[PDB]
Amino acid sequence: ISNYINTIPVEEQPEYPGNLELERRIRSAIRWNAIMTVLRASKKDLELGGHMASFQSSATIYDVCFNHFFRARNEQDGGDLVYFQGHISPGVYARAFLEGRLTQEQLDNFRQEVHGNGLSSYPHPKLMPEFWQFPTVSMGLGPIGAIYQAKFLKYLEHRGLKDTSKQTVYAFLGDGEMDEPESKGAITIATREKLDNLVFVINCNLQRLDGPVTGNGKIINELEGIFEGAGWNVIKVMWGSRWDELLRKDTSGKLIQLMNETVDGDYQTFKSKDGAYVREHFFGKYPETAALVADWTDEQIWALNRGGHDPKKIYAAFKKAQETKGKATVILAHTIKGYGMGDAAMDGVRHIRDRFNVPVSDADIEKLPYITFPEGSEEHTYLHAQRQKLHGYLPSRQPNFTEKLELPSLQDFGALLEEQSKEISTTIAFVRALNVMLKNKSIKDRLVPIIADEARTFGMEGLFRQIGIYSPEDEKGQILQEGINELGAGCSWLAAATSYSTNNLPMIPFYIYYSMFGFQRIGDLCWAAGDQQARGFLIGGTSGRTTLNGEGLQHEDGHSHIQSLTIPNCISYDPAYAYEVAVIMHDGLERMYGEKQENVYYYITTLNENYHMPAMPEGAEEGIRKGIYKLETIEGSKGKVQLLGSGSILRHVREAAEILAKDYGVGSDVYSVTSFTELARDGQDCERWNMLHPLETPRVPYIAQVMNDAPAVASTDYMKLFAEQVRTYVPADDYRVLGTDGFGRSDSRENLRHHFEVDASYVVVAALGELAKRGEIDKKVVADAIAKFNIDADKVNPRLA
Amino acid sequence: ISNYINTIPVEEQPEYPGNLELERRIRSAIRWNAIMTVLRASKKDLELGGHMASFQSSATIYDVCFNHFFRARNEQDGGDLVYFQGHISPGVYARAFLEGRLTQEQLDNFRQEVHGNGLSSYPHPKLMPEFWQFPTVSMGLGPIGAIYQAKFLKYLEHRGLKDTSKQTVYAFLGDGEMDEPESKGAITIATREKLDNLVFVINCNLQRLDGPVTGNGKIINELEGIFEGAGWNVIKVMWGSRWDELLRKDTSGKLIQLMNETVDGDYQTFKSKDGAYVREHFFGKYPETAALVADWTDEQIWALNRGGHDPKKIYAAFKKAQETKGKATVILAHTIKGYGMGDAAMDGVRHIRDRFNVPVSDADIEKLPYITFPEGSEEHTYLHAQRQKLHGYLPSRQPNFTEKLELPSLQDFGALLEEQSKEISTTIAFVRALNVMLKNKSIKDRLVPIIADEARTFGMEGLFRQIGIYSPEDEKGQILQEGINELGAGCSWLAAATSYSTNNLPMIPFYIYYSMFGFQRIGDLCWAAGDQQARGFLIGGTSGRTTLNGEGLQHEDGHSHIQSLTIPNCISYDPAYAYEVAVIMHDGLERMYGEKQENVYYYITTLNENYHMPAMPEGAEEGIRKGIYKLETIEGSKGKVQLLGSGSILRHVREAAEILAKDYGVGSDVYSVTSFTELARDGQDCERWNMLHPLETPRVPYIAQVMNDAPAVASTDYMKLFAEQVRTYVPADDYRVLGTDGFGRSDSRENLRHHFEVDASYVVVAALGELAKRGEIDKKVVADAIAKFNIDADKVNPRLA
DSSP states (O other): OOOSSOSSOGGGOOOOOSOHHHHHHHHHHHHHHHHHHHHHHHHTOSOOOOOSHHHHHHHHHHHHHHHHTOOOOOSSSOOOEEEOOGGGHHHHHHHHHHTTSSOHHHHHTBTOOTTSSOBOSSOOTTTSTTTOOSOOSSTTHHHHHHHHHHHHHHHHHHTTSOOOTTOOEEEEEESGGGGSGGGTTTTHHHHHTTOTTEEEEEEEOSEEBTEETTTTSOHHHHHHHHHHHTTOEEEEEOBOGGGHHHHHHOTTOHHHHHHHHOOHHHHHHHHTSOHHHHHHHTGGGSHHHHHHSTTSOHHHHHHOOBGGGOHHHHHHHHHHHHTOOSSOEEEEEEOOSSTTTOTTOOOGGGGHHHHTTOSOOSSTTTTOOOOOOOTTSHHHHHHHHHHHHTTSOSSOOOOSOOSOOOOOOGGGGHHHHSOOSSOBOHHHHHHHHHHHHTTOTTTGGGEEEEESSOTTTTTOHHHHHHHOBOOOOOTTOOBEEOOSOHHHHHHHHHHHHTHHHHSSOOOEEEEEEEGGGSHHHHHHHHHHHHHTTOOOEEEEESOBTTTSTTTOTTTOBSSHHHHHTTSTTEEEEOOSSHHHHHHHHHHHHHHHHSTTOOOOEEEEEOOSOOBOOOOOOTTOHHHHHHTOEEEEEEEEETEEEEEEEOGGGHHHHHHHHHHHHHHHOEEEEEEEOSOHHHHHHHHHHHHHHHHHOTTSOOOOOGGGGTOOSSOEEEEOSSOHHHHHTTGGGOOSSOEEEEOOOSOOOOSOHHHHHHHTTOSHHHHHHHHHHHHHTTTSSOHHHHHHHHHHTTOOTTSOOTTTO | OOOSSOSSOGGGOOOOOSOHHHHHHHHHHHHHHHHHHHHHHHHTTSOOOOOSHHHHTTHHHHHHHHHHTOOOOOSSSOOOEEEOOGGGHHHHHHHHHHTTSSOHHHHHTBTOOTTSSOBOSSOOTTTSTTTOOOOOSSTTHHHHHHHHHHHHHHHHHHTTSOOOTTOOEEEEEETGGGGSHHHHTTTHHHHHTTOTTEEEEEEEOSEETTEESOTTSOHHHHHHHHHHHHTOEEEEEOBOHHHHHHHHHOTTOHHHHHHHHOOHHHHHHHHSSOHHHHHHHTTTSOTTHHHHTSSSOHHHHTTOOBGGGOHHHHHHHHHHHHHOOSSOEEEEEEOOTTTTOTTTOOHHHHHHHHHTTOSOOHHHHTTOOOOOOOTTSHHHHHHHHHHHTTTSOSSOOOSSOOSOOOOOOGGGGHHHHSOOSSOBOHHHHHHHHHHHHTTOTTTTTTEEEEESSOOGGGTOHHHHHHHOBBOOOBTTOOBEEOOSOHHHHHHHHHHHHTHHHHSSOOOEEEEEEEGGGSHHHHHHHHHHHHHTTOOOEEEEESOSTTTSTTTOTTTOOSOHHHHHTTSTTEEEEOOSSHHHHHHHHHHHHHHHHSTTOOSOEEEEEOOSOOBOOOOOOTTOHHHHHHTOEEEEEEOOSSOEEEEEEOTTTHHHHHHHHHHHHHHHOOEEEEEEOSOHHHHHHHHHHHHHHHHHOTTSOOOOOHHHHHSOSSOEEEEOSSOTHHHHTTGGGOOSSOEEEEOOOSOOOSOOHHHHHHHTTOSHHHHHHHHHHHHHHHSSSOHHHHHHHHHHTTOOTTSOOTTTO
């Protein structure tokens, strides 16, 4: 670490290019409106919330950027990608309002979006599709999200797809938020990939929601120590211009020592105090430092201020950071939390309008008046001039991408629709599909295959030699190999899955990984991707509780689909056959990057198990996209049941159908359920509508237009709820569901499928049991059945094992 | 960064205390049995999996620790807490077998656990409660969890609970693994908390499963750079003893430049080539270094090894780490992957046998024999001697704590069972119940309240001035403040929730944070938590999609219960009243920490909305713990319905009941549902048993005993699946479910509750719908109802909004 002083000494600091006095007036009307916006919200007394303190402290930092740095979207690129801290959004609204892009009515509807003319509390692209771009309130996601976005931009240039060199990625973070493991856990990557197009701006006010991030330490020192050692270039914006005369005449060099030794704890105690106190408790520490201020007045000393509130110091940091290459840069801005507000850390607001000199009489205030700037005024001219010099206004978002893509037709995957020679997996089918896509002239170089190291476990090697591994195995490599780091992989996937919006360059990512480590591990990011309108494919290989048989407890996935069905714009599929993988991928491609431009992303669970892949039944394509279709019906004069299966378990459900036919003369309808989740959501959409339209003609759930009323049994390699979620919509009296509830364990596939009461053996018992409960057959048949299949009816429930 | 050579010179290397030759014999047999286990497992041809290369490259490192460092559980403490590298498990099994703790039959049931006598693939306490302690196969969790396990032990000490000063926490990591954000993301905590009881061990064999961690770089300099910057004491174990004499004779330093300049990728091409090649590529770069090896033989040169394989160098690292105070230490051990595996990376097996002087004859080799050291042998004597000199063998686990806690009875929570004078929230109820627990002599100090900065939000302040905050606000502080860091908080909560087994000292933690950032954000730690048999409370505050109304998209939780019902040993609850949290909390305290010692943890979602809290009805306890109880019955002619609700929505269904009665004559049974998930499990369990017992009278699920056949309506502040999971068990032909499916947004509780279609008016419309559908009342009534209640029947589905 370096001395507790600015990185840029005054004799190396560029001359401030802007109108200081005019920017002051401008920013000040913004702090005010930002403040009016929130108070106005409070009066409503409807528990709306909203912050002011976080913004007053960083306002100047953003102001300098908005005045001399932030490039907005333009003809050549998407501009700088700014990850605005989520709690300073009213300040953005404030300036946005000044720039004339938000109405006053909208300011008043702060945190009241339901009716359509409001604004979200925080950056939420889903809710404000043309304004916000990057979801940041969930602390920690912003930092790592910006790192892989800056890396994705470099990716784009290196690949020759788009020159993104004029774009800079700004990640705006609080110091408190830097404790989230995701905040620094990936900063080493900024060095490996040399992201000199990335700048972390850390607002160092020293506190969280209850005191200094580290009271008896020095957060700036901690941040400087770890980032420096991570290879980043760190710039400290510590003190305002009032300390330069002081630091200059301190020949003893004792002031610096003093600043070095004071812990974040005393600095906070100083600012809640006053000049005299500081003269005594800080300068008063050494004779040499009491003499620096020896002739100053207590007031003057109080005027001393931190770097993060001096445009000149703030400006030098961003300028310097700008001309830096080979590595990312972090700016540690030293600031005062709750700046200008003072008192509390109705009328008493005039204090701020006094601190920043707001043009409002002590009269026209009880109304919380929004301040503006009419065309022709000095402030309005300067406001827009600086923004125009910098290509426009931000934040801003473009909902759709402009170009038309020449997606491959399903016929193009016609090989995947035929019976397959050898026995393969849904993963191999998946890899083959992506290969078909790689033959398409239009989308081949737009695909972004992304793996978390196990290209081995997913048969992606055969693709290394064809499209290469991105490695700025050179900088033209198409595949993004992120290693053991699912969060980083996900951020890359998200940068790619949203390139269509950010840089009007649709890219189509396919990120394959051990399904277990999907939503469970990077879940908050997946929810945020939904928020950012991500359009990509999340491929969860080695899925299913019983299919990744040997790995066990921490790898056996029989619940990922339950987590994904929580994300509204995520479409989930658990396909059993390659022709199903092919149809689903084509449809997804069509819906997301085709004319439709539907905002939704795909999740497809694939398998590491090989078996017979039959040819796609003529006319099945639509049923596959909807979630279900009948494979066949086997005859049987002694009875009839319906059998449903998905993923790797369908074949065992078919194995059952056959058994019931031959051993008990019970016929069946065999159904392939590619997506229980979609069927459920459809089921829910039909009943929601039907309930609100009592007199109108009802909507029958797709699943009820495919199933009849004979008794049913369904089994999947996922917990029962996965198949049970469609109960309400199934048109049959009896619906039994087998599942893999319970922690996973190591064994042969055979052994696990019996342990989890999901194989043919259990499907037949279940089927027979339903016949029995309705006098169609003697219960003893069910009993003799449990006996014949080696089924221990009294072992402990798999959930408890 | 320091020169690419050992941190501890030979002149500072202490004498090696063990018998080198005798430790090599023992290790080699260990090496042999681990290989035999996997190979034998392969033969079954059941795709069981398992590793070898992983262990092969780090055995000496673990070996030095088992002979001279690892402390086993004893009477004073829980010994050293070792987070063994998941994939080196066959090796840990290999040793335990030789120490006579695991049988040959068990070793043959490697990865075949279903039937009772096998061994898990990886460290899984739930699958081997007496052997394993800490789940580590999910990369990145072990290191962070360990940093916090070390902190927790400091806490335990500081609080006067247990002298843990002799326990050392070892985290065994792969260089590939350090890319997980969670891996380095929390390292400054170890510096802040001066955790000199923590040691990170990083097997740096440069090769990640799919390739290099950095072909073009030097991952060792990366780790070092960043851990040093974080404040850690770094010890690099680069080279073996053979070089010392070399590094000395080079009074020119070139061999140091040569060492420093050479890049990982390069260093790899070596290991796999031959003598000359080295003395030609490496020592062949400078006629000052190339001279150092002028005598040597192309094979004398090629024998130079890396420090990570040399016992002497490994001991020094582990001795200096043990001596260090005031910061943690990370040992970067340089090794060679698949060490000595010759060919591959009965000829194969024949190579190792010879390569390690494995006492197996050509006559037994083809039998893939396991080696044992008879009692009386020199090997058997020294192996057990070294363990006894260290308190026993490890890993080992104590499934139950031994002491008896005198738990507060339900009556002790008396005031929370009565009607509340003041309107409060289920969160306040939680704080109050926590206060009751703080008045119980027995557990008061065994409690560990955990929070993620946000205290004020959960009105946790009163306790701060009451039991203080842990900050070595003093070292005797009880509440653990982890700041904006869910992951860290959860690890802390994990250390505390498994203290009972690791230190035979029950500690009862209550972690409250924003429900949204729970499972969604740390889900993989939560699953790992179930594997670790954690017994504790996770309090999901500010929950319910519509209730944290102003925060919007990334804060509104209407799905965490969906995420928590995937964890088998997690008991979730969504209570509506204070009397319910009281009953729930007491029941979990009793179950987890009473004589039952059930291996389960709790997840209770609490609200931030105050409202009238009625008194608990008499005899309602059981139902509250089971998941449902009829709150009350509203008589009425014209019709009968059942109304179910949970969390903050129950209050609105009860308004919906009054309105149904008053305005439509429709009578009803109103049920408070404290846990839809538990009832659901109860339903699946009865259904599971009924199918497996065809000749028995169908057992009836509890919810079905509680309700009747009347058309039912359920509404909750969570997506529809929450109350729908029990459909199969509700004994009414009509069961219509309301829920908050869809992305959250900022608005008033009321507007949101109307937007998500869950408030009073929708409960009524839905109820009337079912009365029409049936036939009982004119469908025009449900038409007017829609009109009367200002219900927009044609607005978008909240799931799509």
